[PDB]
Design an enzyme around this catalytic site. Structure first.
Site, PDB file in Angstrom:
ATOM      1  N   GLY A  97     -25.768 -63.087 -44.417  1.00 11.63           N
ATOM      2  CA  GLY A  97     -25.235 -63.148 -45.790  1.00 11.63           C
ATOM      3  C   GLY A  97     -23.973 -62.321 -45.998  1.00 11.63           C
ATOM      4  N   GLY A  99     -20.838 -62.649 -44.662  1.00  9.58           N
ATOM      5  CA  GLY A  99     -19.642 -63.500 -44.846  1.00  9.58           C
ATOM      6  C   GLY A  99     -19.036 -63.971 -43.525  1.00  9.58           C
ATOM      7  N   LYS A 100     -19.822 -64.051 -42.446  1.00 11.24           N
ATOM      8  CA  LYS A 100     -19.305 -64.543 -41.133  1.00 11.24           C
ATOM      9  C   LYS A 100     -18.852 -66.011 -41.252  1.00 11.24           C
ATOM     10  CE  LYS A 100     -23.211 -63.635 -39.098  1.00 11.24           C
ATOM     11  NZ  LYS A 100     -23.845 -63.073 -40.310  1.00 11.24           N
ATOM     12  N   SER A 101     -19.724 -66.910 -41.706  1.00  7.85           N
ATOM     13  CA  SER A 101     -19.446 -68.369 -41.801  1.00  7.85           C
ATOM     14  C   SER A 101     -18.359 -68.629 -42.828  1.00  7.85           C
ATOM     15  CB  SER A 101     -20.678 -69.148 -42.146  1.00  7.85           C
ATOM     16  OG  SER A 101     -21.662 -68.901 -41.152  1.00  7.85           O
ATOM     17  N   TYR A 102     -18.358 -67.876 -43.934  1.00  6.94           N
ATOM     18  CA  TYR A 102     -17.292 -68.047 -44.949  1.00  6.94           C
ATOM     19  C   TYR A 102     -15.936 -67.713 -44.286  1.00  6.94           C
ATOM     20  CZ  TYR A 102     -14.560 -67.885 -49.175  1.00  6.94           C
ATOM     21  OH  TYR A 102     -13.570 -68.124 -50.093  1.00  6.94           O
ATOM     22  N   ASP A 245     -18.848 -67.594 -34.457  1.00  7.43           N
ATOM     23  CA  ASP A 245     -19.628 -67.234 -35.662  1.00  7.43           C
ATOM     24  C   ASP A 245     -20.979 -66.755 -35.144  1.00  7.43           C
ATOM     25  OD1 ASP A 245     -20.975 -67.034 -37.970  1.00  7.43           O
ATOM     26  OD2 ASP A 245     -20.787 -69.152 -38.664  1.00  7.43           O
ATOM     27  N   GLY A 248     -26.803 -63.236 -37.136  1.00  9.37           N
ATOM     28  CA  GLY A 248     -26.831 -62.060 -38.022  1.00  9.37           C
ATOM     29  C   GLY A 248     -27.202 -60.802 -37.264  1.00  9.37           C
TER      30      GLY A 248
HETATM   31  N1  LIG Z   1     -14.785 -63.227 -49.021  1.00 14.98           N
HETATM   32  C1  LIG Z   1     -15.611 -63.995 -49.735  1.00 14.98           C
HETATM   33  N2  LIG Z   1     -15.227 -64.414 -50.965  1.00 14.98           N
HETATM   34  C2  LIG Z   1     -16.053 -65.226 -51.649  1.00 14.98           C
HETATM   35  N3  LIG Z   1     -17.276 -65.655 -51.326  1.00 14.98           N
HETATM   36  C3  LIG Z   1     -17.650 -65.190 -50.118  1.00 14.98           C
HETATM   37  C4  LIG Z   1     -16.897 -64.375 -49.291  1.00 14.98           C
HETATM   38  N4  LIG Z   1     -17.584 -64.097 -48.117  1.00 14.98           N
HETATM   39  C5  LIG Z   1     -18.727 -64.730 -48.263  1.00 14.98           C
HETATM   40  N5  LIG Z   1     -18.825 -65.417 -49.447  1.00 14.98           N
HETATM   41  C6  LIG Z   1     -20.015 -66.126 -49.903  1.00 14.98           C
HETATM   42  O1  LIG Z   1     -21.125 -65.281 -49.662  1.00 14.98           O
HETATM   43  C7  LIG Z   1     -22.278 -66.063 -49.254  1.00 14.98           C
HETATM   44  C8  LIG Z   1     -22.746 -65.675 -47.877  1.00 14.98           C
HETATM   45  O2  LIG Z   1     -21.643 -65.802 -46.936  1.00 14.98           O
HETATM   46  P1  LIG Z   1     -21.892 -66.486 -45.512  1.00 14.98           P
HETATM   47  O3  LIG Z   1     -20.581 -66.818 -44.894  1.00 14.98           O
HETATM   48  O4  LIG Z   1     -22.870 -67.590 -45.608  1.00 14.98           O
HETATM   49  O5  LIG Z   1     -22.611 -65.302 -44.726  1.00 14.98           O
HETATM   50  P2  LIG Z   1     -23.148 -65.268 -43.208  1.00 14.98           P
HETATM   51  O6  LIG Z   1     -22.556 -66.409 -42.486  1.00 14.98           O
HETATM   52  O7  LIG Z   1     -22.569 -63.951 -42.773  1.00 14.98           O
HETATM   53  O8  LIG Z   1     -24.674 -65.235 -43.190  1.00 14.98           O
HETATM   54  C9  LIG Z   1     -21.841 -67.520 -49.400  1.00 14.98           C
HETATM   55  O9  LIG Z   1     -22.219 -67.994 -50.687  1.00 14.98           O
HETATM   56  C10 LIG Z   1     -20.328 -67.406 -49.163  1.00 14.98           C
HETATM   57  O10 LIG Z   1     -19.646 -68.505 -49.700  1.00 14.98           O
END
Ligand SMILES: Nc1ncnc2c1ncn2[C@@H]1O[C@H](COP(=O)(O)OP(=O)(O)O)[C@@H](O)[C@H]1O
Length: 349
Positions: A97, A99-102, A245, A248
């Site tokens: 959660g 923000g890796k995938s984002y 990516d 976690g």
């Molecule tokens: N820099 C950012 N700005 C806006 N939303 C973000 C950002 N980084 C992450 N998010 C949001 O936060 C949530 C979790 O990010 P996600 O990429 O799924 O995490 P992970 O891949 O690390 O488990 C999602 O709803 C994603 O869109």
């Protein structure tokens, strides 16, 4: 050169808002500070990176670190190194959660595209801007998942194979029978990325989202072909671009994640336990060998994630100390050409 290290803190998510979380992350210039919300009396811990990205607010803020800005710093630099003939790697690290995938993929809705789509669009835009008819190019894509040390082909999901990772006796690790598809446009590579993202492993525990325990490795083989008129020799420059990516970081089948930590720690300290996991074996060259490498560490802003965010910052801080040994891909025929050409002009005189 060093591993380049960026950290990035996102806005609060639903879980954090649910618990009325406060922000424990502050950023100024290249430094990130984290307060301990459980021992508010102890002095905050500060860390310095190549970049500290403040994405805690919204794109309406002047100080919000955008998808474009993150790409234009590390993604563009690595694409330029690939054009020079270096192998390059960017990996996204941090808690589920965070923000890796984002950061790596982002979203299509509203310029939310991450490093992978922006790099692919930039790559094909640069190729298609070529004015020299002596330059010709090839772009091959592979997309794999590592989940519980098993490798799946995301570009050929009808291969329930758990592809075998092998060491070539001379040329290093590879995934036996992994699809490598020729692509000649940004649209084509985007469709494969989309199809590949849909084939990633889901988990009930993540409400049937992509498993938090799966690694995704997106590879481009970029071949630059220079045709020499006088000699008819074509010289080749080949660069491997690895965009990762990770699973976690929070805490047999966390083998890869736990081994990555030991590898980073041992490389920072400089035996190296590359072969203890499929991830660290396949990425061996990218972790201190023949590669220009960057880490983007995703951070939760929230008090409730103190211990995991502190652990991400300490691994990011260690990655900064890793040295790489990247060399330019050199065609020996570049020298044969220079010789054959001098020898002919000299005779012609
Ligand atoms: N820099 C950012 N700005 C806006 N939303 C973000 C950002 N980084 C992450 N998010 C949001 O936060 C949530 C979790 O990010 P996600 O990429 O799924 O995490 P992970 O891949 O690390 O488990 C999602 O709803 C994603 O869109």
């Amino acid at each position: 050169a060093s591993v380049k290290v960026a950290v990035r803190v996102r806005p609060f998510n639903s879980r954090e808002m649910s618990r009325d979380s406060k922000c424990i992350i502050q950023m100024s210039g290249s430094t990130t500070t984290i307060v301990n919300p459980k021992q508010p009396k102890e002095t905050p811990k500060s860390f310095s990176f190549d970049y500290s990205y403040w994405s805690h607010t919204s794109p309406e803020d002047i100080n919000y670190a955008s998808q474009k800005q993150v790409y234009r710093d590390i993604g563009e630099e690595m694409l330029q190194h690939a054009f020079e003939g270096y192998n390059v790697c960017i990996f996204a690290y941090g808690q589920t959660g965070a923000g890796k995938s984002y950061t790596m993929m982002g979203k299509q809705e509203k310029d939310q595209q991450g490093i992978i789509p922006q790099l692919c669009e930039d790559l094909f835009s640069r190729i298609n801007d070529t004015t020299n008819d002596n330059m010709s190019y090839s772009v091959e894509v592979s997309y794999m998942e590592i989940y519980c040390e098993r490798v799946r082909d995301l570009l050929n999901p009808k291969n329930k194979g758990n592809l075998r990772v092998r060491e070539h006796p001379l040329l290093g690790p590879y995934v036996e029978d992994l699809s490598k598809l020729a692509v000649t446009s940004y649209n084509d590579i985007q469709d494969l990325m989309d199809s590949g993202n849909k084939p990633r492993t889901v988990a009930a525990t993540n409400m049937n989202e992509t498993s938090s325990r799966s690694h995704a490795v997106f590879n481009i083989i970029f071949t630059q072909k220079r045709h020499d008129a006088e000699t008819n020799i074509t010289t080749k420059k080949v660069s491997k671009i690895s965009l990762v990516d990770l699973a976690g970081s929070e805490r047999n089948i966390n083998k890869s994640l736990t081994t990555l930590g030991k590898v980073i720690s041992a490389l920072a300290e400089m035996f190296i336990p590359y072969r203890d996991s499929v991830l660290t074996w396949l990425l061996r060259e990218n972790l201190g060998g023949n590669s220009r490498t960057a880490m983007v560490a995703a951070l939760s802003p929230a008090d409730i994630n103190y211990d995991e965010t502190l652990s991400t910052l300490r691994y990011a801080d260690r990655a900064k100390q890793i040295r790489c040994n990247a060399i330019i891909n050199e065609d020996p025929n570049n020298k044969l050409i220079r010789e054959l050409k001098d020898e002919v002009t000299r005779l012609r005189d």
